[PDB]
Amino acid sequence: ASADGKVTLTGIVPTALIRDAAYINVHHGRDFSGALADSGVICTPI
Amino acid sequence: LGVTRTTITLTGMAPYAIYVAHYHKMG
Amino acid sequence: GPTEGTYTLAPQAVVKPAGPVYAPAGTAKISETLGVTRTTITLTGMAPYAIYVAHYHKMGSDGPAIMESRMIAQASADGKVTLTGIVPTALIRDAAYINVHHGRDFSGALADSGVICTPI
Amino acid sequence: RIAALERNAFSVKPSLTIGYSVSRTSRNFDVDRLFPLNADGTVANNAFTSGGIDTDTGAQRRDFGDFGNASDPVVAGAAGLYGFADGVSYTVYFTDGSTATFDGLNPADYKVPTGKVIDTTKGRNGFGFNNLARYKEGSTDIGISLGFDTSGQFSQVTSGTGGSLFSTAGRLQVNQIDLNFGLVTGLPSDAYVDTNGNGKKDDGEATGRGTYLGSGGTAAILRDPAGNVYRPVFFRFKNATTQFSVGNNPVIVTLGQQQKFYFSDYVFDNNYDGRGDGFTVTVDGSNVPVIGAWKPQIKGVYGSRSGLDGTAEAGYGVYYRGVRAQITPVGTLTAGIHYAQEGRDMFGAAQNTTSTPSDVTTYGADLHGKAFGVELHSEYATSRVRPNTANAAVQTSNAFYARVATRKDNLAFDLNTPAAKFGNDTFGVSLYDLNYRKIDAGYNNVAGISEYGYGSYSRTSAQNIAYNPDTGVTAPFANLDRQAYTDANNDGTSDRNADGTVVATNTKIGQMGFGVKAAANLGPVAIGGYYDTSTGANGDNANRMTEAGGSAKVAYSIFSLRGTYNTLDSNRPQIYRDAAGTQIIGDAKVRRYAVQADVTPGLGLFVGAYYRDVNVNGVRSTTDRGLLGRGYLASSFEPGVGNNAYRTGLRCADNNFGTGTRDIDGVGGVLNPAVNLDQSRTATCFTSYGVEAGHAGDNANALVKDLFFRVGYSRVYVPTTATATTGDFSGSVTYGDARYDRKVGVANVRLAGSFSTTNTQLDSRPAGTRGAVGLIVRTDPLENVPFRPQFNGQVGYYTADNRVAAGNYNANATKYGAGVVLNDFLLPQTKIGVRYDGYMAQNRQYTPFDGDGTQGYFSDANNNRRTNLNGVYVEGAYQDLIFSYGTYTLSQKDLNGVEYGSGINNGQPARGQTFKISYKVNF
Amino acid sequence: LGFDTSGQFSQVTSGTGGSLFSTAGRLQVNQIDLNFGLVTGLPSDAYVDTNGNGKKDDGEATGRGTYLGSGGTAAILRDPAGNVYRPVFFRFKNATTQ
Amino acid sequence: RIAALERNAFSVKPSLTIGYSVSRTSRNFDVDRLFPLNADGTVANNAF
Amino acid sequence: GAYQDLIFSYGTYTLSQKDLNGVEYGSGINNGQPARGQTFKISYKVNF
Amino acid sequence: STATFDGLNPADYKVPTGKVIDTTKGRNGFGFNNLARYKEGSTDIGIS
Ligand SMILES: CCCCCCCCCCCCCCCNC(=O)[C@H](CO[C@H]1O[C@@H](CO)[C@@H](O)[C@@H](O)[C@@H]1NC(=O)CC)OP(=O)(O)OC[C@H](COC(=O)CCCCCCCCC)OC(=O)CCCCCCC
Ligand SMILES: CCCCCCCCCCCCCCCCCC(=O)N[C@@H]1[C@H](OC[C@H](OP(=O)(O)OC[C@H](COC(C)=O)OC(C)=O)C(=O)NCCCCC)O[C@@H](CO)[C@@H](O)[C@H]1O
Ligand SMILES: CC1C(O)C[C@@H](O)C(C)(C)[C@@H]1CC[C@@H](C)CCC[C@H](C)CCCC[C@H](C)CCC[C@H](C)CCC[C@H](C)CCCC(C)(C)O
Ligand SMILES: [Cu+2]
Ligand SMILES: [Cu+2]
Ligand SMILES: [Cu+2]
Ligand SMILES: [Fe+3]
Ligand SMILES: [Fe+3]
């Protein structure tokens, strides 16, 4: 998250896998190896 | 064509934290 | 045809944690042989990554600690510390409770004063 | 912030080794041949082994000595104690001051003085003597090392903007790399400075430890009077990634070195090594609107052979290109075409040397798949090679085949699965193979631009098949070659090798033919047949090899009766032994017919009677010379009801004996838990008849649970003298085997036994009686008696009366070994253990590994010598400090009793003693 | 420039061993006296001990002469831009032998 | 404490360069004299 | 040309210097052929 | 010893050193430096 909270997330995913996804949830992490610390800091439908 | 690039730009977050974001299905 | 949708995200309201629940619990196996004592304190549900100094506090609770029994270790990623120590029996004579504490440094130090204690 | 700190932080890993070692020997023999063999065949671990297990060269722990700091390999023959110890190895001095080493027990037989060297009388009489004694002076060694590992989080790369006429966006593709790097303090013993770029250590390149003094070893140590030790720090890394891919859905472009690609067999079978450096593009049209259900695909390859390489190399100034296109119009039938080309540029046409063609241009099409209940596999190719030189005279060569058969996933054709199935079980005519072949004579791996292949894989096994698993030559049919006597230097007599084998000159003839294998499944009956004729590409009958055959089985209840007829008519030369036993090259005719009946009562037992009759070149041919294996369609049946499978291969090892004469242990395999002697067959088709009962313990409802025996009797045909037409079934073989594991109480017993009363020399086994027995006991720790003892045990006896044309000698062996481990000894965490092993042998020997895949083995030799290997090994342990002590003695006497061991000829055995203190410590 | 370590590597724990059996392991903790770090350059008295005696014989190596640019003024591994390069060595001294 | 750790910590910077190149000439002339000149007088960038 | 970030560069150039007669002194081995230059590159910039 | 003459006519090599004499080793004591340069096609991965 930079130094003032300027986190910029990006990523490619085949549309076929995406199907039935309803909301892109943003969580905090415990390390750069994925993992889940907080369960939903910010989120939007689609 | 068949891939999806997604740019979630967040601001006013925590100074040096990790922000893992993915797509949660309907449930 | 670059189908593009721009959506502002809402700041949420439910931010409950996700990981090891700090619920201290465990057992002790003090085993005497030929004048030496080997103590194994396997703990679970502890802090995910923390040094856990444990020694033998004498009776007196407050009481002094026979510091020639300090067992030091750090926890894993779920909170599992395995303290192990070799102490002469004559030293641990007149000890009352094995008190586990928190370690400010791998050199020892008692950050906390007893997160868990077992009567010996 | 802590994660950021950890991402690019060093993990400091220090290592300390502490240990005391002393070892004194006088001959440096081997002791790993005394230790028990585990159920996986490995020998039991000990503290004295030198190691040396190499799978590439077949080396094992039993091929090297175990005393001193030397790992001297055992030497076969008399120089070594007949494969039991180290060689004598005199040293020969020369006039010019140079010296050589003679490996023999008698220096007078040094028949190899070089052209100008003369033996100077500097030693005894110009011959020295290399001392056979090895010493490890007792010392305690501390070894300290340090390394710096990285977090391992640098496994990704993201592309950056580029371009000159324009500018790409950047950050468009993420590539996963396989870079493993860290910091080391000291160099490995095998490091070197590669000054040529070949990537291999040439003649004394640098010995990197010698380039950077103080890196490692004891020759140089960078020190300080204060006691500090300095070691250079190096950045070590491996890059396993050489390919980078770009693009996701329709188009993917891969750039890298040694690109591996595959258009088809016969064109670009260029995988398993790759061809060179360049790029490949793959376009997948499986989502196109109009035509996407046919899964159209396009592949394109460009590259430079071997990348950049110095002149005189085949890949200098040579570049390849290609494009293939395929679809799947029906269920699984994939059809494709492909163009391939390889050529020299203006810098390769000149100053390249070698013989790479000035140009090769191959076209092809293939139709592999499974569409309508049948499986089709077709292939066509055209070469058009431009043969460099000046006139060139471009040469064309095609390769076409059309097969109705089942190909496996590894692209090998499975001829046991029908792929036709024109009916059900009651009426089940099944087509197994139906193929045609028109491979041309000039079609090799150069014609179709591939790495290897397109030639008979065996020339003794199925020789019409080019499929080579070793070099990845996936090609059903091979370019056959014609063989003939060489007669290189001498005239009038054909050239032979030292062993007597013939030397042949091979001329490629190509291949053209057809073949059908089918089977009709009746009810209680089943029948099958096969036919196959292959000529040369031109079609001349001087190279024809026809195999035809057929079998019929009837199985009902607990009875089965089979009858098989096989033929082989090869005008093609073929290399094989004649009746006398000398290899020859010449046409062959083989006619075999076998009627074998089997009965299975169902209680785990089985009985089998057979009568097999071979007929080679018109004579009764006691044993076929492997000729019947020249064809790839053999297809015998198998006993049992409801087992109507027409599997390729004549099961000649059925209901017959074994002819093994080699063994890992001293005794004839009866003491090896990884060898089942009751399941040992000869795999040679004989003209014989006999019966064989038995019993299997794995089959349920068996008399004894884990019990196997294979008692059997047989009679073998032998001609009158050596080559007479007349003969009789005079040979006789009576064999028996047994194996019973059991577990009585806490102990784990294991009994094995073998017997044989052959009358003639069958394959390599001489004519004589041969018996062997072995017992292995392994008790688990006893928790009732004090000390928690844990016993072992091992006994093995072997006898053999070899009646060879040069003697009637007896070769017997006796191995034994016992040992007890006390798991609770006085003080806490204190252990003691002792093991005594012994091995006595009459005229037997050990043959070490040959440096190839073949391993060493114990065999019978007429050496009038008796070996008496013995030893005791005591291993005690305090908490974690291990004291190992071992004393062993090897004495090899002759009939007189001269005691040749310790070959300084003083009548003393070779002796070895070792003492170690081991202590493993971790930071 | 020097790189010191935390000095927390002063202990070793034994590991399981044995061939006829297998010891438990982690049974004894030994205190060692290893002092190590990273140096950039060699001292004046360093030398290459090619015999094992542990002493500087007649002109053994003059370790600053083996690794040019380690120290002194006789040799300096330079760069036209003005950068100076010095080899990095792992220095260590082990006072524990029992 | 994190600042103290970061003060004397190494930043590990790895670099990877991947590229394919082939070039054949008989005289080795110059082609940069053909490319357009920018408003600052520099010649246009090219890959050759 | 450029796919996502992989750049394919190809270039073919010819330099011929004749005289009034037309001797074509380029490629000065004196065989009446111009100097020629061809290059092919695949470039890919990656970052850690 | 050898020298390099920079000219289209070796006969104008008016600078033979004090004691050197042209040995008829090449055509007539004068060779010819090849004017052709080659970069054999390869893919390079560099790691740092
Ligand atoms: C998006 C990028 C757009 C294209 C960029 C501009 C390039 C095209 C312009 C014409 C440029 C290409 C014109 C074709 C020259 N010919 C070649 O093929 C030569 C082959 O070498 C040698 O081979 C021998 C037998 O094989 C003989 O013929 C020799 O005589 C020859 N050597 C010589 O003496 C030198 C002539 O390769 P080269 O050394 O010149 O290498 C480079 C070539 C050409 O480069 C490309 O253009 C490939 C681009 C593919 C991207 C595919 C990826 C698509 C991504 C969506 O690359 C090849 O391999 C392809 C072969 C030609 C087919 C071109 C059509 C796709
Ligand atoms: C998805 C897309 C992937 C892209 C990557 C794949 C690229 C595919 C490229 C396909 C191009 C068409 C091929 C035509 C086949 C003609 C059939 C064919 O190969 N002919 C054979 C061969 O030919 C020689 C070749 O011909 P060629 O026309 O191939 O080369 C011209 C040109 C190359 O330009 C440059 C860089 O100089 O390449 C093209 C087409 O652009 C040539 O003139 N080179 C001179 C030198 C001679 C030695 C090679 O001559 C004989 C043997 O000496 C004989 O054996 C012929 O049968
Ligand atoms: C167009 C376009 C766009 O602009 C916007 C948007 O639509 C897109 C980005 C998707 C796009 C890109 C589309 C892109 C994906 C391209 C389409 C994909 C296909 C795949 C390309 C190749 C098609 C050709 C086909 C494969 C050839 C078929 C011929 C067979 C091979 C013949 C075999 C016969 C054999 C010889 C018989 C056997 C004989 C013997 C004797 C051997 O037995
Ligand atoms: Cu050995
Ligand atoms: Cu090359
Ligand atoms: Cu292959
Ligand atoms: Fe080399
Ligand atoms: Fe010295």
Residues A45, B24: Cα–Cα separation, whole Å: 10
Mutate to test the interface with H, among G15, G29, G30, G43 (most CBs of H within 10 A): G29
Declared resolution, Å? 2.5
Helix (H, G, I), strand (E, B) or coil at H22: coil
Counting Cβ atoms within 10 Å, is residue D525 exposed (0-12), middle (13-18) or buried (19+)?
Answer: middle
The alpha-carbon gap from F40 to the nearest alpha carbon of chain H, in Å, equals 33
Q: Do B1 and D250 touch (CB under 8 A)?
A: yes
Identify which of D920, D923, D878, D833 has the alpha carbon closest to the alpha carbon of residue D19: D920
Find the D306 Cα to ligand 5 centroid distance in Å: 5
> Which positions in chain A have a beta carbon within 8 angstroms of at least one beta carbon in chain B?
1-16, 18, 20-32, 34-37, 41-43
**Structure tokens belonging to residue E74:** 């006789």
Buried b (16+ CB within 10 A) or exposed e, D693-721: ebbbbeeeebeeeebbbbbbebbbbbbee
**In 3D, which of D748, D747, D749, D712 has the Cα closest to residue D732?**
D712
Q: What would the DSSP string read from start to end of D825-893? A: -SSTT-EEEEEEEEEEESSEEEE---SSSPPPEEEE----EEEEEEEEEEEEESSSEEEEEEEEEE-EE
Which of D870, D904, D907, D906 is closest to D890 using CA atoms? D870
The torsion defined by the Cα of F18, F22, F27 and F29, in degrees rounded to 10, comes to -50
In chain D, residues with a C-beta closer than 8 Å to the C-beta of E11 are 923
Residue D97 and residue D74: Cα distance in Å, rounded? 30
Of the candidates F16, F20, F26, which has its C-beta nearest H43's C-beta?
A: F20
Amino acid found at D579: A
Of the residues G3, G14, G31, G40, the best mutation for testing chain F's interface (the one with the most F CB atoms within 10 Å of its CB) is: G40
Q: G3 CB under 6 A from ligand 1?
A: yes
The span from the CA of E60 to the CA of D190, in Å, is: 25
Residue G1 forms contact with H (CB below 8 Å): no
C-alpha F6/C-alpha D509 separation (Å) is 74
A21-26, strands of its sheet edge to edge: A42-45, A21-26, B21-25
Query: Does residue D343 line the site of ligand 2, with CB under 6 A?
Result: yes
d(CA D352, CA D358) in angstroms, rounded, equals: 11
Find how far residue G12's CA is from the centre of its chain.
4
- Cβ contact (<8 Å) for B3 and D3? no
Interface contact D257, partner E, CB < 8 A? no
Q: Which token pair is D900?
A: 């040749």
How far is D831 from D822, CA to CA, in rounded Å? 6
Rg (CA), chain A: 12
| SS3 call for D515 | strand
In whole angstroms, give the CA distance from residue D467 to residue C91. 76
Nearest ligand to the C-alpha atom of residue D468: 6
Record: contact G45-D160, CB cut-off 8 A: yes
Q: Cβ separation of E27 and D829 shorter than 8 Å? A: yes
Is F40 assigned a ligand-binding role in the annotation?
Answer: no
Contact present, D806 and D766 (Cβ < 8 Å): no
CA–CA distance, D726 with D425 (Å, rounded to integer) = 46
Q: Do A1 and B16 touch (CB under 8 A)?
A: yes
Q: What are phi and psi of D244, to 5 degrees?
A: -125, 130
For chain D, give the number of residues: 923
Length of chain G: 48
Among candidate residues A25, C47, E36, the one with its CA nearest the CA of residue B19: A25
Neighbors of chain B by Cβ distance (3+ pairs < 8 Å)? A, D
Listed residue (D867, D860, D861, D864) closest to D660, CA to CA: D860
Do D458 and D426 contact (CB within 8 A), yes or no?
A: no
Contact (Cβ atoms closer than 8 angstroms) between residue D448 and residue D266: yes
Cβ(D293) to ligand 3 under 6 A?
A: no
Are the C-beta atoms of D530 and D509 separated by less than 8 Å? no
Give CA–CA dist D439/D398, Å, rounded.
Answer: 6
DSSP state of B15: T
Kindly state the tokens that stand for H23. Answer: 């040995």
Strand partners, D336: D326, D366
Half-sphere exposure of D210 (CA within 13 A, CB side): 7
Contact G40 H43 (CB under 8 A): no
Strand partners, D100: D92
Nearest to D528 by CA among D661, D634, D424: D634
Angular region, C62: left φ>0, alpha ψ -120 to 50, beta rest: alpha
| Exposure on the CB side of residue D513, measured as CA atoms within 13 A | 27
Contact: A39, C17; criterion CB under 8 Å: yes
The answer to whether D509 touches D481, Cβ cutoff 8 Å, is yes
What are the residues whose beta carbon lies below 5 Å from ligand 7 (ion)?
A: D 194, 196, 198, 202
Beta-carbon separation of A30 and B12 below 8 A: no
Residues of B at the A interface, defined by Cβ within 8 angstroms: 2-26
> D765, D746, D804: which is closest to D662 by C-alpha?
D765
Ligand nearest to the CA of residue D364, numbered in listed order: 3
Ligand 2 atom closest to D360 (CA): 55
Question: Helix count (H) and strand count (E) of chain H?
Answer: 0, 1
Closest partner residue to H35 (CB to CB) among G28, G40, G42 is G28
DSSP, res D764: S
Question: Is G6 in the F-facing interface, judged by CB distances under 8 Å?
Answer: no
How was it solved? cryo-EM
Residue D190: C-alpha distances to residues D72, D141, D207, D232, E50 (Å): 20, 22, 7, 17, 20
Residues D123, D130: Cα–Cα separation, whole Å: 11
Say which amino acid occupies D117.
Answer: V
Give Cα D834 to chain centroid, integer Å. 37
CA D773 remoteness from chain centre:
30
Span from the CA of D325 to the centroid of ligand 3 (angstroms): 6
Residue F21 near chain G (CB below 8 Å) = yes
Give the best residue of D7, D8, D246 to mutate against chain G (max G CB count within 10 A). D246
User: How many Å lie between the alpha carbon of A19 and the closest alpha carbon of chain C?
Assistant: 15
Is D415 in contact with D432 (CB distance < 8 Å)? yes
| Residue D351 · residue D315 · CB < 8 Å | no
The partner residue sitting opposite A32, judged by closest CB among D7, D174, D249, is D7
By the 8 A CB rule, do D359 and D447 touch? no
Spatial contact of G4 and D173, defined as CB atoms under 8 Å apart: yes
Instruction: State if residue D321 touches ligand 2 by the CB under 6 angstroms criterion.
Output: yes
Closest CA–CA distance from residue B15 to any residue of chain A (Å):
5
Residue D341, ligand 1, Cβ within 6 A = yes
Give the total residue count for chain E.
98
- For residue F33, give the 3-state DSSP assignment: coil
Q: For the residues of D582-645, what is the DSSP string, one character each? A: -EEE--EEEEEEEEEEEE--SSSEEEEEEEEEEEETTB--SB--SGGGGSS---B--SSTT---
Residue type for position C55: H
Residues with Cβ < 8 Å from D490, sequence gap 6 or more? none
Q: Is H25 annotated as a binding residue?
A: no
